Amino acid sequence: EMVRKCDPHIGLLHRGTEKLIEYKTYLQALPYFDRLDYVSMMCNEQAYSIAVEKLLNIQPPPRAQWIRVLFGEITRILNHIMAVTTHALDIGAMTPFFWMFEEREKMFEFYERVSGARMHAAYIRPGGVHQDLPLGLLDDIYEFSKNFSLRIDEVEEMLTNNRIWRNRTVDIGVVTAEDALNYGFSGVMLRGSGIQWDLRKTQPYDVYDQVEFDVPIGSRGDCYDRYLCRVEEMRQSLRIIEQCLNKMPPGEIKVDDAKVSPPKRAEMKTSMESLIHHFKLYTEGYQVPPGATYTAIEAPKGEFGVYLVSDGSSRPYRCKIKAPGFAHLAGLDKMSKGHMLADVVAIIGTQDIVFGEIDR
Amino acid sequence: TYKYVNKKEQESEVDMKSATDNAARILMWTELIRGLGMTLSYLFREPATINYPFEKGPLSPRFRGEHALRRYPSGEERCIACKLCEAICPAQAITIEAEPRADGSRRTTRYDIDMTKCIYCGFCQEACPVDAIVEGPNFEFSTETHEELLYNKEKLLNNGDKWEAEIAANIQADYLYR
Amino acid sequence: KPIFSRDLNEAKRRVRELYRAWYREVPNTVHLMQLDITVKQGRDKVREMFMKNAHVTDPRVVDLLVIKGKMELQETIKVWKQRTHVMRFFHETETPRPKDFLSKFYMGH
Amino acid sequence: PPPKLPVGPSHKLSNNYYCTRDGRREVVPPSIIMSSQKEKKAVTPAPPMKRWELSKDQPYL
Amino acid sequence: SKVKQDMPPPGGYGPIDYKRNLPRRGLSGYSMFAVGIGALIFGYW
Amino acid sequence: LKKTTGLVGLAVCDTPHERLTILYTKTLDILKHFPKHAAYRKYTEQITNEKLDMVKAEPDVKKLEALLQGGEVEEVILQAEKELSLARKMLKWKPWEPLVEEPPANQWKWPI
Amino acid sequence: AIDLIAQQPVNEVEHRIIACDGGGGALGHPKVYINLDKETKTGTCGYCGLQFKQH
Amino acid sequence: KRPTVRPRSDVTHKQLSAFGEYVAEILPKYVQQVQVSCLDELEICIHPDGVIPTLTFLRDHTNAQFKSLADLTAVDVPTRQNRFEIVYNLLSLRFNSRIRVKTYADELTPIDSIVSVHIAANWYEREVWDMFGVFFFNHPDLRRILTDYGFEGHPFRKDFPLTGYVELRYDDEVKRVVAEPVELAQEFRKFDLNSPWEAFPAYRQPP
Amino acid sequence: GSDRSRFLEGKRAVEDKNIGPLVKTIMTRCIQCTRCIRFASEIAGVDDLGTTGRGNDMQVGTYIEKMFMSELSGNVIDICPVGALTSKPYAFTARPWETRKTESIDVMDAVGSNIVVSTRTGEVMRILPRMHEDINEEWISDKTR
Ligand SMILES: CCCCCCCCCCCCCCCCCC(=O)OC[C@H](COP(=O)(O)OCCN)OC(=O)CCCCCCCCCCCCCCCCC
Ligand code: SF4
Ligand code: SF4
Ligand code: SF4
């Protein structure tokens, strides 16, 4: 029952998204990104939006930036709940999954209230966001956030010090810092083993450079350390949500360049130029200036990136997606050396892999 | 800014009271008992489930569901063959074949939506310049046969007639945001 | 600027090695996959697939073909490829479409 | 309640020419440095990153 | 008609508890073992 | 003495100053065999001499790390080892030579 | 459709040119002005089809 | 300054240019070109023979500790003589900076495998071989990674049709999932949405 | 062009004359560029279309109610930039992004006129000029079109 070799065969969920995108305009490709990591949607579409904004040489408005950071943190909470609870369910413990999926449903309710879809919102659009927060959503977010801490603390009182959990994780999937860097790991696959890296701090995007949050780092480098790291990341996400709620500013929500973002419907209905802009935007789309870029974000799993090459048309020329988990599932073998089948089942969870992103 | 999550700090502190506490922890299963207590505490809490059939959960006016084609109060299909809906639909689910009418009017003679290809994205309802195509509140339209999921202008218009009230209310309550 | 083999004379050696390998493998596949074919049928199909690329003369393209064929042989040795995939070579559901004009003139174009 | 949403910065009737705020048209072609077509000091890609400062909110968890 | 847009309440929202609150239980240890030893002796006799 | 280095697998070095002096001197020795004009030789000698001077100057390990700008002195030692191996490989790769072959007509042209 | 746009009034507007929305305001169709200088017919709004006359 | 135009900074541009000259003169043998984009991202284009030297240097040299490989993308431009363009994106944690190293390849011109340098490439190069078809020398284990087991083709090639040459179904006669030539119901509708006018005059190429 | 509208007044409106069965005349969406008039006076030499009045109310049309038919009449649809003069048959039968565009030759006329015969999924939607300097020179016959 000892694992002598791991040969991850993937591609069972590959649907040629990278080639499909090349045939669709820049607005028509955004929904794909919400499906690349179906667990953390808005962060993927945030990566796309930042990349396209970089190429367009335009800047999102302040309220849109704050909203994007807020919903990015909510998405990070969603991803961490999924990772931790599915990991626990596969290891054996089952109750925390049911406990926490109620809060996942509440966060989905926020998702739907803002975007009209419980996931795959397509809310974040190159230029800012599609629509402004419906009144009261901040109040509901406050009500949810003020209590989420107690629920995470209950999950911790279940799992943190339990001898069974500690024996089932500790000193499992131990990866050295140099080996991780060479293997190309990212996110918690790096911070767990002592490496002090987090793009939100090192290379900030949006308004991550105006909110204070700590970055948990692990010492042992094993599954238990990384589970603790994810829980602490959830707590820091609550911190950031508090700050965003308190500092949400007034103003527009989408770049006020009607050649990039659609004009408001009333303007479309009473302005000639605005109607022309609506027509061309929703038919031909924007014309992104030629160039190439590699935008990176600290997606709830790791470092979600887009290498985008544009030739001046309204459709991208090439859109490679660097999924955080690709290198992780590549390094599964190294991590699983000298472990049993159960340990391997544990090891796969720490990676927190979504094969939507793995396969692209 | 970083905070250690699990770094062992000061070690020399060994005491008789500490040792008996540790031995009690190991032998008596204290943390396991505590987890059991947590589970019981949950046992005595009101369930979070809902009797779904007679109690649907909340949905906001922006909710995207089964499509519909609206009408003017006079009773006329708003569809003016914009064709922008068909141009923007990312999944290419809309098919429009339009011809001039006997009234010297622009209308559509084949409006088909493949609801097995639509991704329920709302791009049509937001790129319709006369608010013809909308995504109504309905979310229960599962069918036994595939061919019943290939919609047509008729079925869409009957859905519009059926849901006109709720579609009207949502549009009324949301148009300011749009 | 050759891939592996400098010349066609060198490349055909690798090609023949690949054929040796496939011929030696066919019995094992037919047995351990429970395919409903005769080992003779398998060997003949291997020959046919090899002959399909007989016209090629470029040493580098011959090398690339050998690489692809060796990957496929590996995929069959390791039993990664299943029966549903192995049988796809045989085209057992295909109805040969006619070739003479008098009849193709009659089925479409 | 019925919202009333603010307008953007470019809801101005004057001094609003698009040529003075066209972000798209500012994208110049990349700056070549060394090209086959056409004692100094050591240089790093960028100044070395400082050391992260241990937090004070709750230093050790 | 002024702008009525989603905003935080004047003066900001109240503080949020976002840190671990796992307490440390008071149970001693000598008591834990003494209860068991007393029960054992009683049962033995 | 540091009890632990945060990074996993990188163990504490008892004699950091000695190890650093040794590695830097070895690098400076291997560099002598590069052609005197090599840009690699010039730059690597500047870099190595700077760090060697810092090590010789400062006794305390904390202040040595701060001066070196390399996090843990063990990480710096590892980097010194990497640089030495890189020099060993460069001696055989001879990067100082002129370009091997110019690019095709418009190979590096975009938008096409 | 045809019968329902056939069964309605033919509105009166005293001006030479009349603006048309769908009727909802900002919930209708883009504003379009129809000129009612022809007296042998009534101005038909392209988006909604409503008919206007000059008096 | 301007609400709707991205803020512009020049410090990073200057540092990246300086490092561009750094690398350009430390590796004259391989580097064919260097550039810094208006986005301020350093881009070094090198001869394919120089991938291993260039990346080994970029990983090990003290002034450039590019210890992470973000990705090993490939682009396909069919007009240029060498269709395939390999793009190694690199990250350096010590200096908090990224670089891009590019090279070219053809249907019959392999690129050396950097698995010795970064083990993270083990799967990225497999993907490149699977999709674009660029062979990689000395790869420890090179296979398809994202395509079907019996797949024939190279999907991300521009010429490769979007819908492929084969579709799958279950044939109740043989009781298997067979492979048939593709036959869509409503074939993919392309759209001609390129405007007649030129938008960005910096890129208008003169004769 | 700019991104927004500072015009806070009502818009001009014009009457849609009858010019015949071929060229529908939604004149309100006219930029009054006189390409149609110049073509009528020069290429076809018919001298029907002309400009009336002065100022905004200037109207491009026949101030009687003539029907501007000619062997070259249909080309007004092509030359007119903004959709003022449009084809009565092709009204709202397709959109330019949808349609396939294949080049061919006209055989209706012995002239040899070249053509683009644009089709949208199995149906030929319209026939439009294909520029050949010597033969057509961007103009075709109304019969052909
Ligand atoms: C007067 C003179 C004579 C005096 C004589 C004095 C005798 C004193 C005897 C005191 C000892 C009591 C017996 C305790 C047995 C437990 C053995 C033990 O020490 O724990 C082992 C294990 C803990 O795990 P671990 O940390 O690995 O321990 C070894 C560390 N090297 O523990 C475990 O196995 C826990 C893992 C399994 C958990 C199973 C879930 C159980 C849930 C709680 C059940 C509670 C109720 C049980 C009672 C049921 C009654 C019907
Ligand atoms: S759905 Fe809307 S945009 Fe599409 S044809 Fe109908 S009215 Fe026009
Ligand atoms: S919701 Fe999106 S996918 Fe569905 S029909 Fe509308 S545009 Fe197409
Ligand atoms: S060509 Fe068209 S736009 Fe120009 S004046 Fe004539 S009708 Fe008006």
Ligand code: SF4
């Ligand atoms: S498409 Fe052109 S001609 Fe037609 S209404 Fe719009 S601006 Fe006027």
Ligand SMILES: [Zn+2]
């Ligand atoms: Zn109207």
